[PDB]
Amino acid sequence: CLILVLRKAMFANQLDARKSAVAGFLLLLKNFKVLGSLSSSQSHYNSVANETFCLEIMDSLRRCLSQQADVRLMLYEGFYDVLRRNSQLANSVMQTLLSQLKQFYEPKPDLLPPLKLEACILTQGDKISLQEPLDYLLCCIQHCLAWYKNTVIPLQEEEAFYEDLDDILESITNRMIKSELEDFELDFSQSTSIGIKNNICAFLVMGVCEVLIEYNFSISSFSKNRFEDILSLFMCYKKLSDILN
C-alpha cells in the first residue's frame, strides 16, 4: 500500500509532493537490507523478495530521475547513503548514473567539452531553469566510486565499467585542463535569459571543476603531473570565480 501511494504520488504536479515521494523512496530502499553480501551495518528471511523489491524500486527511480532539478538534487544527495547502507544496489546505481553520464559525456577524447549546455539546462518558453546538475552527478559518482574502491574491492565479468568510469573522469580531467572560456561562451545576469543560462553554466563548470579537483587529489597519490593538473584546474576555477565576481 505504501509503495502504491508513492508511485501514485510520483506524477502529482506539486513540487513538495514529488520531493516527499522521492525521499520516501530513497529512505525505504535504504532501510530494506539485501541479505546477499551487504556490507555490515552503519534483514527479512525472504532475501530474493528483498532483492527483486529493491530492483523494481530502482526501476521506479529510473522513472524518477527525468524530472525537475530539485528531485534530481535530492536523488544524488541520497544515493551515497543508499550505497553506504546497501551495497548490492550500487551495481545498478552507478550504471544508472553512468547512463546519465552517457547522456552528457561525449565519447571522443578529441572533443573539447564534457558538458553540453543545451541538454544540461531546461530550455523552455519565456524562462530558463536547471534540469540536471552535472556537478552533482560527478559529485555522487566520485563519492560512490571512492566508497567502492575503498571498501568492496579490498573486501573481495562486470568490473570493467569501474575503470571505464575512472577513464571517463580522466578524460573529463584532461579535456577540462585543455579547455577555455571560448567553448562555454563566457566573458551575464538576470536581465536576459542568455545571461541567466550563462550564469547557470558558470555555476555548473565551477562545481564540476572542484569535483574534478576532488577526484584528481583522490587518485593521484601525490604525483607531480597529477598535482600540476590540479593546479591548472584550480586556476581555471579561480578565474571563473573572479569573472563571476
Partner: protein
Amino acid sequence: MQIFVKTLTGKTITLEVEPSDTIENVKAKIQDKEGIPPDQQRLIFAGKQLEDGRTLSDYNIQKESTLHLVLRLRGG
C-alpha cells in the same frame, strides 16, 4: 436492476446488481469492469458513506440508482 456509477469528471458506468447483493460484490464487480482495486475506492449515496460489509437492501437503492464513486488516490 441496473445502477449508474458516476465517477469524478462526469463519467457514467452502467452495471447490473441484484437487490440481494452486497457492497462487497459491488466493489468486486467494479474491479472486474474498471480495474480499480476494491479497497482503494469508495462509494457514496444520498451523501451518506456506504458502510462496508452491509447489504445494499438496507440502503434505499432502487432502479436506476445513482452511486457516486470517489478514489482516495488520484488515477486509481
